[PDB]
Design a protein around this ligand. Structure first.
Ligand SMILES: *[C@@H]1O[C@H](CO)[C@@H](O)[C@H](O)[C@H]1NC(C)=O
Ligand SMILES: *[C@@H]1O[C@H](CO)[C@@H](O)[C@H](O)[C@H]1NC(C)=O
Lengths: 226, 218, 218, 232
């Protein structure tokens, strides 16, 4: 079966190089024009570069022209992308896609049809030492019905953190939002659950934060303070 | 250097009715062969995107016959004969005429329901933000439809900007509602100066924008 | 050979006109891009800036060379680096340490314009394999003094049916000198003997002309 | 444990028929009377060199030998050649195989081709990107060693790959014996018989009598004195 495996991701400081590699397995690699397409975090796609069936590049994106350098190898069934002089705006996923029409199968040669897509890598760029999360409480407003309370994680890097409530049992009424990014690169997010105000002044509620790279599992007992 | 646009920007569809979307260009893509080079692409929530239509209207391989493509010149349209529960996500149109290629901003297709109003809450900084110089305020909006809604952060009528950010979640599978949350961060030099802090929400379901305010020093 | 839109089309070891009637074992098409008239630099047995470091040729290259212009396409990216001919020096580690690759300045400078180069390296007697130009197969006539072109092997003789028990892989057979004493025929897989057409010097026997003008011939 | 390779290793170099004729050719052969390496499979499949092609002789009555892995890197790096023979399939492959040690089941890629009671002897050569395998199967009833006798070696197959190979390793089935020899550039005199099958050969480069047999171009020499070479 057709497979498209890419590799090369990892944290890289700004002003360095990387070499992404996409390997194809399951078709005649010489009759298909490859493409490399980025995907910004939580945004739309964006074409980056491509290569035709005769190892002849087809130009790069307008805002990236000057640094990226594509190359192809039919003998080893591989497609390489060298990347130099990075900036903080080049963090995104990267897929390597394949064309549809085999060459000389019907005017000109074909370039469209990005049909088969591999699961992209997670290239990122930043300059910040790995710091642990800070956990903050969000007590109930103490103003009818059901009131919401939560906990906010601030100044952590990198992803992903995992937040649960009541050690894992409480699942109906939870909400956790994606990790927004901050000024200094230290991320932040929060989670909140809504419970009856009648159960606000005597029950037990704890949110549990787990950070894998920093190797921590912190507990937070959230209750109204007055 | 060709810029596209799509319309409508975001539309709610309900399972069992046709859906139409229009992609517009700047230069007509009619090549010498007589073929338009536009392509229509789909992305599901949480997976790699997939191909829908290539060469204007030639249906791609392996997709069902419920999609239709039409148009020419500088205007093209995609219409699904019948929409179902497995047709949500993002749609893009891609040129293939003049390199570099380009992708449209993207149309967001989701499931429609009855309009619901948000529930609003406010959250001031704790005592852990009184010994750490960093003060954060959080405004929370849950269980509202549709996606569009907006917030003002108000401090003694002096609207701010830049420093306040926001984030939203995916559509809840069961009741099909959204949640937004905004945060405002500041130093320990002005937080303990201004008195009344307010989060203002504007949404269709509310007659007037709702202001939730708190005062310092209870 | 008559579509002269190319720049240089020079065949070495083969005359271009007689290319239509030869079944080659195999051909190798080797292609690259080089700037300027470096076609002269790449010559069999010669030297040069590119030849001495990039891509050499043997002393008996029975092949052909083609080159033309690519100004319409190439207008930094193009790069170029005591080695055996037909080599891939992919080992390009920097070597105190300097640049390994010098770049061609793609620009409408004839003076320094880029070029596309192709090399067609034939092997015509290196395998039983057959690759021929346009020709028509005919019915072979047996036991008549005829001239034959068995997929390149050109000769003249009388083709007597043979039973020489060739092994399953041998294309043809021979004897002491370079004498093709049999052949295996394409399209019928039969063993044909070859016999020389008769010859032998005549001689004239005569009494003196002062006696008679009669004569006998041996 | 080494073995005396009596006369093995003479194949057909040229694809043109001959008949009852003595032809002297220089090629890459296995010299007469060498010490071929033994390998016993009790309680054995190390990495061998591939300097100049390989003469691989497999004596078999159990059919557990299965193929060959050729390469230099041998872990999904370069197109390492592979020959595998199972109950129906004889697959020749050049993929970059991802399994380090002895890939089989007991009891990236550029090319593919699909087709002590016996002696199957093969010779492997690699010239100008053509990998040539010449095989022969012979019926024997002997349990101990490589027998004493002469036979031709029919040229079987060629493969267009063209990679540098310095090591190779045979492979078996998990849950015998064989011999290996290497090749040197000698100059033989072959006796093409009436039907055209090598019935005998003399290696000019072995001892003086064979040198004179090679100069006279016959298999018998009268008495006398013959000038053969030049010391310098
Ligand atoms: C040519 O065609 C005939 C049958 O039409 C066939 O016998 C023969 O094998 C063909 N030639 C080759 C090389 O296959
Ligand atoms: C091989 O040679 C022998 C005698 O040299 C003769 O019987 C025949 O030519 C061949 N043998 C066969 C066909 O059995």
């Amino acid at each position: 079966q057709v497979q498209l495996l890419e590799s090369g991701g990892g944290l890289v400081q700004p002003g360095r190089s990387l070499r992404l590699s996409c390997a194809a397995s399951g078709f005649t690699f010489d009759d298909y024009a490859m493409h490399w397409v980025r995907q910004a975090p939580g945004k739309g796609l964006e074409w980056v570069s491509g290569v035709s069936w005769n190892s002849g590049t087809i130009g790069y994106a307008d805002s990236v022209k000057g640094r990226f350098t594509i190359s192809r190898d039919n003998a080893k069934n591989s497609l390489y992308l060298h990347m130099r002089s990075l900036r903080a705006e080049d963090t995104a996923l990267y897929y390597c896609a394949k064309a549809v029409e085999m060459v000389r199968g019907l005017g000109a040669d074909p370039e469209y049809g990005m049909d088969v897509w591999g699961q992209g890598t997670t290239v990122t760029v930043s300059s910040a030492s790995t710091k642990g999360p800070s956990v903050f409480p969000l007590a109930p407003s103490s103003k009818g019905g059901t009131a919401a309370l939560g906990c906010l994680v601030k100044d952590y890097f990198p992803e992903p953190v995992t937040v649960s409530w009541n050690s894992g049992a409480l699942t109906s009424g939870v909400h956790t939002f994606p990790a927004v990014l901050q000024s200094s690169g230290l991320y932040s997010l929060s989670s909140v659950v809504t419970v009856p105000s009648s159960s606000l002044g005597t029950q037990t509620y704890i949110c549990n934060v787990n950070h894998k790279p920093s190797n921590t599992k912190v507990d937070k007992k959230v209750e109204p303070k007055s | 250097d060709i810029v596209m646009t799509q319309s409508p920007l975001s539309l709610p569809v309900t399972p069992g009715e046709p859906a139409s979307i229009s992609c517009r260009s700047s230069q007509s893509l009619l090549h010498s062969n007589g073929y338009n080079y536009l392509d229509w692409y789909l992305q599901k929530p949480g997976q790699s995107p997939q191909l829908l239509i290539y060469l204007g209207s030639n249906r791609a391989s392996g997709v069902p016959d419920r999609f239709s493509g039409s148009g020419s010149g500088t205007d093209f349209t995609l219409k699904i004969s019948r929409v179902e529960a497995e047709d949500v996500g993002v749609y893009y149109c891609m040129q293939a005429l003049q390199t570099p290629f380009t992708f449209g901003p993207g149309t967001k297709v989701d499931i429609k329901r009855t309009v619901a109003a948000p529930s609003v809450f406010i959250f001031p900084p704790s005592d852990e933000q009184l010994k750490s110089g960093t003060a954060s305020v959080v405004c929370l909006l849950n269980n509202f439809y549709p996606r569009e809604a907006k917030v003002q952060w108000k401090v003694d009528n002096a609207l701010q900007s830049g420093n306040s950010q926001e984030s939203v979640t995916e559509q809840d599978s069961k009741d099909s509602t959204y949640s937004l949350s905004s945060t405002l961060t500041l130093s320990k030099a002005d937080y303990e100066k201004h008195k009344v802090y307010a989060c203002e929400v504007t949404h269709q379901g509310l007659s007037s924008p709702v202001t939730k305010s708190f005062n310092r020093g209870e | 050979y008559n579509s002269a839109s190319f720049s240089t089309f020079k065949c070495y070891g083969v005359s271009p006109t007689k290319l239509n009637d030869l079944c080659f074992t195999n051909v190798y098409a080797d292609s690259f891009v080089i700037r300027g008239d470096e076609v002269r630099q790449i010559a069999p047995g010669q030297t040069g800036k590119i030849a001495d470091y990039n891509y050499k040729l043997p002393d008996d290259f029975t092949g052909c060379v083609i080159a033309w212009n690519s100004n319409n396409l190439d207008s930094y990216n193009y790069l170029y680096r005591n080695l055996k001919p037909f080599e891939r020096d992919i080992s390009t580690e920097i070597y105190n340490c300097y640049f390994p690759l010098q770049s061609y300045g793609f620009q409408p400078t004839v003076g320094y314009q880029p070029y596309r180069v192709v090399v067609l390296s034939f092997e015509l007697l290196h395998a039983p394999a057959t690759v021929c130009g346009p020709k028509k197969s005919t019915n072979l006539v047996k036991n008549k003094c005829v001239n034959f072109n068995f997929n390149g092997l050109t000769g003249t003789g009388v083709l007597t049916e043979s039973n020489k028990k060739f092994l399953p892989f041998q294309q043809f057979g021979r004897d002491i000198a370079d004498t093709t004493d049999a052949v295996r025929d394409p399209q019928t897989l039969e063993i044909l003997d070859i016999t020389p057409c008769s010859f032998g010097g005549v001689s004239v026997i005569t009494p003196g002309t002062n006696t008679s003008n009669q004569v006998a011939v041996l | 444990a080494y073995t005396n390779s009596f006369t093995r290793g003479v194949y057909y170099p040229d694809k043109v028929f001959r008949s009852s004729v003595l032809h002297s050719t220089q090629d890459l052969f296995l010299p007469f009377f060498s010490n071929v390496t033994w390998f016993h499979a009790i309680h054995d499949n190390p990495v061998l060199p591939f300097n100049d092609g390989v003469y691989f002789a497999s004596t078999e009555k159990s059919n557990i030998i299965r193929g060959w892995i050729f390469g230099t890197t041998l872990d999904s790096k370069t197109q390492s050649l592979l020959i595998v023979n199972n109950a129906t399939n004889v697959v020749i492959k050049v993929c970059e195989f991802q399994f380090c040690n002895d890939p089989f089941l007991g009891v990236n890629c550029t090319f593919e081709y699909v087709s002590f009671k016996n002696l199957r002897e093969f010779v492997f050569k690699n010239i100008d990107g053509y990998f040539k395998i010449y095989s022969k199967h012979t019926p024997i009833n002997l349990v101990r060693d490589l027998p004493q006798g002469f036979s031709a070696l029919e040229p079987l197959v060629d493969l267009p790959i063209g990679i540098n190979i310095t090591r190779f390793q045979t492979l078996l089935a998990l849950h015998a014996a064989y011999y290996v020899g290497y090749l040197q550039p000698r100059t033989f005199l072959l006796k093409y018989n009436e039907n055209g099958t090598i019935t005998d050969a003399v290696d000019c480069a072995l001892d003086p009598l064979s040198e004179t047999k090679c100069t006279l171009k016959s298999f018998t020499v009268e008495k006398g004195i013959y000038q053969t070479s030049n010391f310098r």
